[PDB]
């Protein structure tokens, strides 16, 4: 048996951040990784046609200080996603160019409903503790309804309900009827709320890494050398003896003081446990699926949309569109002109039936109509990745909680099981679902183990992160009118009173 | 490597039924069972205090002809669950004795609401094909709603909503807000409707096996001998080569022409596949949890409830009661007097934190109140099983579908993956979730392999079952008034 202090299961950003912190603290770590590569839900493809492209996790932004610090220490740089020209909101077959993070509306009644929808998501968010969403005062009531039921109660206009539906689909790669209202409200609040999560400039989608996000996991692998074991899927964890035994699919045995599970929670199911998991984790890892997404990148000779004063951002409502959201994916140098689009939730299932060529054709025709541009029909190259296919991911971007599960099972997500500690973005309390959350969770799990070993006091398990000097965070602000304009039901109450 | 015609993964009723059919046709079968026992979600414990007790699946009834034929061939007999005396509905702190399958109501508005709720479950089921619930005309509408939403829409009275909620909790060991309305309506319809699924006399709970349901899987293991490998959890399936390779956790390798997966769908996640599973199956097996239940049996010196003209059936509304439903578990001789109770769904999760003795005390004080008898406070023995604990079940009774999953992934459940065919009660089209469904799905999956081998024609894969001579089904009837009384909003539209 190969002996060490800590086995880390999974060489994603979370596992690799954990392994590096333990290695830096002078412990002997092994990383057991299922795939022939590190990075997990991050994957940077390199070829002559694209140079490099993120097929998984890509965007970082302000308030994501841990992934920024980690990446800067490994010698990586960021650049800004193109948001110089106009965004497009495409609704009912027509494109409406706009500026600012929120797609605007002119109908006064529709304006009240839209303003009240975003405001109410944040209002409800402020009731939900980041580190214990089940302690929200109405946790039970909100967890026992889907986001569909919540939008049916909140949205007094089809226009707000359609944009709200797209917001859920895009943010968590799941249908409104699939997800807990409590869990979704938590997810948005723990990323800093509606404006921060939806924004390119000043939000989640502001930046990409020069050379791709896969470099984070690769460069930590370089520092760890042969401590990373590729094509070692873990099958078996035994805690009945003094040292934890960890067995891989190729029959290798690792022996450790402690284990970090840095895999998506449900992929816990791929491991046979001795003794059996406690009841609540046993059931929790069968109740927490990952969302569905195809990330598609169409290449063009030039970023032609910019010549029409379009930045490349498209927000596209409704059923017929294969893609509901795009960003400019052009290199910072201005070359390898490209549009990144997501095929979301049920469409990732429905359209997987097509060939790569048939999906490229549908995306080109959509982009031609939305951009009013025949050049969109002249792609030079295409890359895509259906994350629904991945045995060792289960989906992307992250784990969603169906109705009733977060209040019954949420406590056990990062609860240690004897000498097993839980990392993975899903166990984060800030930007859970993101690369940021992966770094928070890996470092926190590593420090739980350092605490258990008596190397650090308890108050060092959770540590705040200094703000990036490279990517300073502009605060989120509201106007007086945004704060106090009535809802549609509010307005009707005012009317009736008069 | 150990070579055979078919490896069956799982030695529950479904895997054993499949293995027996294939063995009987002259194929060399191996059954790989993760546990040190067969039976899976069935488990019969024997000791001097109980003689025998079903701690998992127990009840069989009319229209369940496959489990009744298989058990009969294995030498098993049934006896009737005691329903001679009165059932009890305990509502707002008081016991209301009754007869007939449906707890009655006296308020005329509440009466319209109750009548409408049961009738509407069956009306909606009539449009849901048993073999394809996703082809229901309103499949997407019904799938994108929870049973909580449907009950909030349908039930104008708290009385009807409390009993409908208990119905869902009892039937599928899950909360109304956890489950798809489409999936739940399918589940009821594919057991023959509300009356058939809730009934003791002439329904699903009519009978038990003399000596326990465990004997079904045990006696098929007896027939198959050392073709059954106990403590062989399957970890890896490789279909890249000429023969399928199946590896176990103890590093044994089995080589076969075909595989039957006879495990709960989600427990497919415990197996690493080469090549990877197709996308839709890869995601489906992360979306399909099993429900939560503690099955509890309190033993008494005598079936004392019978002295008060109670049969031992208790229907107990509300949050406070640990147990919402009981049946008499007394043996047919009138000895080993016992009450079987279920601790359902969230209560299985909440009350798991207590000790065994603390659960016994709560159950005995509840039974004392409902049965109005101090004798309930004097148990002679207790047995219980928390099915939430089981690494190789994931829960009980069966797999539930959360909103949106059945329409998007339902077609995947019995779709073959190269030379892997799918058994398990979850894949049945009649009494899916039951021992009956297990037999249906095991035999159908075995016959899919006999067809792939050219041994039987396509039209023999699915096979009707002659009706049991021992347990014949009596028709389900309704009254003129049940069919035609208006709903509450019906009565309001008239006013
Ligand atoms: C898929 C995706 C996700 C994503 C995104 C777009 C797509 C298409 N966009 C993002 C974005 O722009 N910005 C961002 O910050 N996040 C974005 N995401 C999410 C992001 O990729 C993830 O949150 C993050 O990468 C997750 O990191 P974590 O380290 O927690 O998880 P992982 O990447 O899944 O790594 C787990 C590793 O474990 C291995 N594995 C699995 N099972 C085993 C077993 N049994 N034994 C050993 N190793 C195992 C996996 O192979 C993986 O490497
Ligand atoms: C738990 C339970 C279920 C139940 C019930 C009450 C409770 C508390 N009441 C029932 C009732 O009164 N009447 C009835 O008809 N059903 C009732 N049920 C449900 C019933 O028990 C089940 O529907 C039925 O037993 C299901 O059988 P099936 O054969 O489909 O599935 P299983 O019993 O779970 O068997 C699966 C076997 O596979 C083994 N396993 C699991 N993973 C592996 C791996 N990786 N490798 C090898 N073997 C594996 C399991 O150990 C099990 O033996
Ligand atoms: C008069 C009926 C209006 C329905 C409006 N919607 C938005 C559909 C529901 C509001 C629910 S709530 O009334 O705010 O609870
Ligand atoms: C009154 N409840 C029963 C709450 C809703 C009526 C159902 S409906 O939605 O109005 O038909
Ligand atoms: O929540 C998000 C966007 C919401 C939104 C944007 C524009 C208009 C309305 C909603 C959003 C969240 C995450 C991602 C990521 F991580 F995958 F890249 C992309 C987008
Ligand atoms: O649906 C069931 C009973 C429903 C019911 C009975 C009386 C009043 C209201 C609902 C019911 C379903 C299954 C089981 C079993 F086989 F798992 F034990 C037991 C009971």
Residue numbers in the entry:
A (entry chain A): 2 to 499
B (entry chain B): 2 to 496
From the paper:
Chalcone derivatives exert their anticancer activity through multiple mechanisms involving different targets, and various targets are also responsible for the effect of chalcone analogues on neurodegenerative diseases. In this connection, although a number of MAO-A and MAO-B inhibitors are already available in clinical practice, the need to reduce their side effects and/or to improve their selectivity is still definitely of interest and encourages studies aimed at developing novel types of inhibitors. The two binding modes in MAO-B are likely due to the peculiar morphology of this isoform, which is composed of two similar subcavities separated by the Ile199 and Tyr326 side chains.
Considering that docking calculations on 13 suggested two alternative orientations, one of which was clearly favored over the other, we sought to investigate whether para (compound 14) instead of meta (compound 13) trifluorocarbon substitution could play a role in discriminating the ligand orientation. Inspection of the electron density in the enzyme active site revealed that 13 and 14 bind in the hydrophobic cavity of MAO-B (respectively). In both cases the chalcone moiety is accommodated with the carbonyl oxygen pointing toward the bottom of the active site and establishing a hydrogen bond with Cys172 in one of the two conformations that this residue adopts. The distances between the cysteine side chain and the chalcone alkene unit are 4.0 and 4.6 Å for 13 and 14, respectively, both of which are too long for the formation of a covalent bond as previously observed for other targets. Interestingly, 14 is bound in the opposite way with respect to the flavin compared with 13, with the CF3 group positioned within the aromatic cage formed by residues Tyr398 and Tyr435 in front of the flavin.
